[PDB]
Enzyme design. Structure first.
Site, PDB file in Angstrom:
ATOM      1  CB  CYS A  44      -0.965  -0.036   1.229  1.00 46.17           C
ATOM      2  SG  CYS A  44      -0.198  -0.070   2.831  1.00 46.17           S
ATOM      3  CG  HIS A  61      -6.686   0.401  -1.370  1.00 50.41           C
ATOM      4  ND1 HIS A  61      -7.095  -0.579  -0.414  1.00 50.41           N
ATOM      5  CD2 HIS A  61      -8.001   0.119  -2.138  1.00 50.41           C
ATOM      6  CE1 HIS A  61      -8.068  -1.361  -0.486  1.00 50.41           C
ATOM      7  NE2 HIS A  61      -8.933  -0.718  -1.765  1.00 50.41           N
ATOM      8  CG  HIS A  65      -4.575  -0.518   3.658  1.00 46.81           C
ATOM      9  ND1 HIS A  65      -3.518  -1.351   3.104  1.00 46.81           N
ATOM     10  CD2 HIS A  65      -5.511  -0.474   2.809  1.00 46.81           C
ATOM     11  CE1 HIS A  65      -4.162  -1.561   1.913  1.00 46.81           C
ATOM     12  NE2 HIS A  65      -5.254  -0.925   1.760  1.00 46.81           N
TER      13      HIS A  65
END
Lengths: 153, 118
Positions: free
Chosen positions: B31, B92, B80
């Protein structure tokens, strides 16, 4: 003699060992020290493994119960592990736990001798489409082991 | 400071790129490596983890298009991140590939920690 039930428990152990290694530390070793600091090498940013995984030998010995010898060596290569000043180092990275491996189901793909491949269908935590993940198990030193470092994440 | 249009365009062009822990190339992203990779097309930015971007980026009270959104997942605090693309959606790099997801998703919503501006 590796059932779907047994293969999933093995895959889950592979996942834990992969996560701990990429994260730099086996959380069971409470005495460990985590060297701080970062450096750039070959256009990547590196951090140091914690001391309990501070050398390739320590990493190999942590991983040997669960991963085959070549799985481990290829893992080191695939993830650009380096030894800097005698300390094992890994590029900066972030895990991702979206795949709910504990809730997965398995199908037999193939088997021969002391090798067997199962394909896991793994639901996600957020309801995005379930993921297909093949895992190949190999009997090494008369123990079932996962033949790829990063097959279970 | 960035070109927001380019940043979002470059991110969308990568939909489907698979995951790789530590990944910073089109053969696999994590990420934060995805964010770094798209940012590095326009400017200089150190590659750090998601917690690194949480600390280094600028606090904002809500995201505009091109800002970054952060979530708590496998550990407490930011673990994240993605790029806010508007319409309550964010792009993402995830375990099963670079993806567009909703902030109203029943998993992401209660885990949304906040937004930052580069």
């Amino acid at each position: 003699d590796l059932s779907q039930k047994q293969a999933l428990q093995l895959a889950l152990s592979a996942r834990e060992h992969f996560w701990n290694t990429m994260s730099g530390h086996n959380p069971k070793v409470k005495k460990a020290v985590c060297p701080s600091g970062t450096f750039e090498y070959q256009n990547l940013q590196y951090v140091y493994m914690c001391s309990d995984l501070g050398t390739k030998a320590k990493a190999v010995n942590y991983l040997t119960p669960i991963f085959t010898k070549t799985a481990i060596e290829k893992g080191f290569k695939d993830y650009h592990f380096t030894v800097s000043k005698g300390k094992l180092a890994v590029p900066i990275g972030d895990g991702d736990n979206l795949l709910n491996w504990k809730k997965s189901t398995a199908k037999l793909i193939s088997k021969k001798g002391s090798t067997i491949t199962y394909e896991f269908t793994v639901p996600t935590l957020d309801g995005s489409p379930s993921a297909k993940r093949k895992v190949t198990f190999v009997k090494e030193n008369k123990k079932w082991k996962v033949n790829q470092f990063d097959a279970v994440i | 400071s960035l070109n927001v249009s380019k940043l979002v365009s470059d991110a969308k062009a990568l939909v489907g790129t698979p995951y790789k822990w530590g990944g910073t190339t089109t053969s696999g992203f994590d990420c934060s490596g995805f964010i770094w990779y798209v940012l590095n097309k326009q400017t200089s930015v150190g590659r750090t983890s998601t917690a690194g971007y949480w600390s280094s980026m600028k606090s904002i009270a809500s995201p505009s298009v091109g800002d970054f959104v952060f979530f708590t997942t496998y550990k407490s605090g930011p673990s994240h991140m993605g790029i806010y693309i508007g319409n309550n959606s964010f792009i993402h790099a995830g375990s099963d590939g670079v993806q567009i997801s909703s902030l109203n998703n029943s998993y992401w919503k209660p885990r949304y920690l906040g937004a930052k501006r580069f």
